[PDB]
Amino acid sequence: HPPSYVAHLASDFGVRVFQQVAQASKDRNVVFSPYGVASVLAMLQLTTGGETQQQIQAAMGFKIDDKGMAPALRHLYKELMGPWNKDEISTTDAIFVQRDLKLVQGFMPHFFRLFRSTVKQVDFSEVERARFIINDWVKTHTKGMISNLLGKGAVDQLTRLVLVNALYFNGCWKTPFPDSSTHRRLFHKSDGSTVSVPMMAQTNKFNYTEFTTPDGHYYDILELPYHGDTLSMFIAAPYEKEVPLSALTNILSAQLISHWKGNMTRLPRLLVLPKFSLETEVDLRKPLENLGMTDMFRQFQADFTSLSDQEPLHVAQALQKVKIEVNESCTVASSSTAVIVSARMAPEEIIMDRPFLFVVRHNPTGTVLFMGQVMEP
Ligand SMILES: *[C@H]1O[C@H](CO[C@@H]2O[C@@H](C)[C@@H](O)[C@@H](O)[C@@H]2O)[C@@H](O[C@@H]2O[C@H](CO)[C@@H](O[C@@H]3O[C@H](CO[C@@H]4O[C@H](CO)[C@@H](O)[C@H](O)[C@@H]4O)[C@@H](O)[C@H](O)[C@@H]3O)[C@H](O)[C@H]2NC(C)=O)[C@H](O)[C@H]1NC(C)=O
Ligand SMILES: *[C@@H]1O[C@H](CO)[C@@H](O)[C@H](O)[C@H]1NC(C)=O
């Protein structure tokens, strides 16, 4: 096992799924979790057989069943549930299933053995009760932060199978932003218009690098450490207002991000950054079909035989919902101000007053925990 061999495969697949999601979200805010969807699909591997299993193993690039795959994955989850987790991130996977289905012998114990947790049984014939329960389990397993994951809308008598994934993150900066150096400021939407939003400021030695699109536009990559350095945020945007964020989105990969960090250098800057707080339900169906995982939504074609042996089964709904707060510090509404040794020495100014991209990486492993674009802060 090359170090973090699995971790790198997951984040990877996780990033690939993300492109998909960004392609479908031009001009909208999105926050997403590469890790989450990777974990949830790894689980699903066990409920599946035939081509349905194949489509996933081919898309994820490892087989959950082989030697040390599940072993390495729970260890990953442990590293991320580390003691350093001062309640910064809550995480939840859940596979829900209609209630009177003969589960194939061995499934439960096996699932518990490789994954802990278990498949949750509910009665979808009971209308709104069933979502209510799914929504409650989700709320409580994400420190109350994510509510209505399962939409008042769809899911009916006939729904028999549903995956859910949900994360919440509110991280504590290594150096958090002065409260006093936060002031209003114009943010330029992509359509050129203009909006007055609160931007944070902090002047500091950042890790920094400048890359270029294939179409020859320059763009900034900036690393923000979180406490004790387990995680970092990466911020990226094209220099030129005129350039849509897509130029970046459409080329994002796991490897690109490596190149970014690899290629960084500590440099003094003044950083103006919008304070922001996003919550996005992502529907997984299209992104997954697009990576080859078609069978799993399809009656008469999906192969759930590793789970149930009274045929008819297919995934009704595959939802991830994510909330991320970035604003000054996780801390008791009030962060360490105000210090500044600022004459006319002014270091260069990087201002995120245009749409931009963010990435939260768990540093030892390289896992992209979260990912997103800020369109209107
Ligand atoms: C930092 O980032 C660069 C990539 O970004 C470039 O450089 C930065 C600083 C900016 O100037 C950007 O605007 C640039 O785009 C990383 O560069 C990549 O690094 C690897 C080495 O790890 C190098 O791989 C080599 O590949 C060749 C042959 O294979 C290639 O295949 C591609 C297909 O995409 C082909 O088009 C390309 O021209 C190559 O022929 C082998 O000969 C070597 O054995 C080696 O494997 C990449 O090619 C290289 N890319 C570029 C554009 O330079 C650099 O590693 C990062 N630094 C750190 C510390 O990670
Ligand atoms: C800058 O670069 C490397 C790896 O990210 C690390 O050794 C260093 O602590 C980083 N410093 C930051 C983000 O301030």
Curated annotation (Swiss-Prot):
InterPro entries: Serpin_CS (IPR023795), Serpin_dom (IPR023796), Serpin_fam (IPR000215), Serpin_sf (IPR036186), Serpin_sf_1 (IPR042178), Serpin_sf_2 (IPR042185). Inactivated by proteolytic attack of the urokinase-type (u-PA) and the tissue-type (TPA), cleaving the 369-Arg-|-Met-370 bond. Its main location: secreted. Keywords: Glycoprotein, Protease inhibitor, Secreted, Serine protease inhibitor, Signal. Glycans are attached at N207, N263, N327. GO terms for biological process: angiogenesis; cellular response to lipopolysaccharide; defense response to Gram-negative bacterium; dentinogenesis; fibrinolysis; negative regulation of blood coagulation; negative regulation of cell adhesion mediated by integrin; negative regulation of cell migration. It is found in: Secreted. Expressed in endothelial cells. Found in plasma, platelets, and hepatoma and fibrosarcoma cells. Pfam families: Serpin. One of its GO terms (cellular component) is plasma membrane. Belongs to the serpin family. Serine protease inhibitor. Inhibits TMPRSS7. Is a primary inhibitor of tissue-type plasminogen activator (PLAT) and urokinase-type plasminogen activator (PLAU). As PLAT inhibitor, it is required for fibrinolysis down-regulation and is responsible for the controlled degradation of blood clots. As PLAU inhibitor, it is involved in the regulation of cell adhesion and spreading. Acts as a regulator of cell migration, independently of its role as protease inhibitor. It is required for stimulation of keratinocyte migration during cutaneous injury repair. Forms a heterodimer with TMPRSS7. Interacts with VTN. Binds LRP1B; binding is followed by internalization and degradation. Interacts with PPP1CB. In complex with PLAU/uPA, interacts with PLAUR/uPAR. Interacts with SORL1 and LRP1, either alone or in complex with PLAU; these interactions are abolished in the presence of LRPAP1/RAP. The ternary complex composed of PLAUR-PLAU-PAI1 also interacts with SORL1. Interacts with PLAT/tPA. Also interacts with SORL1, when complexed to PLAT/tPA. This is Plasminogen activator inhibitor 1. It comes from Homo sapiens (Human).
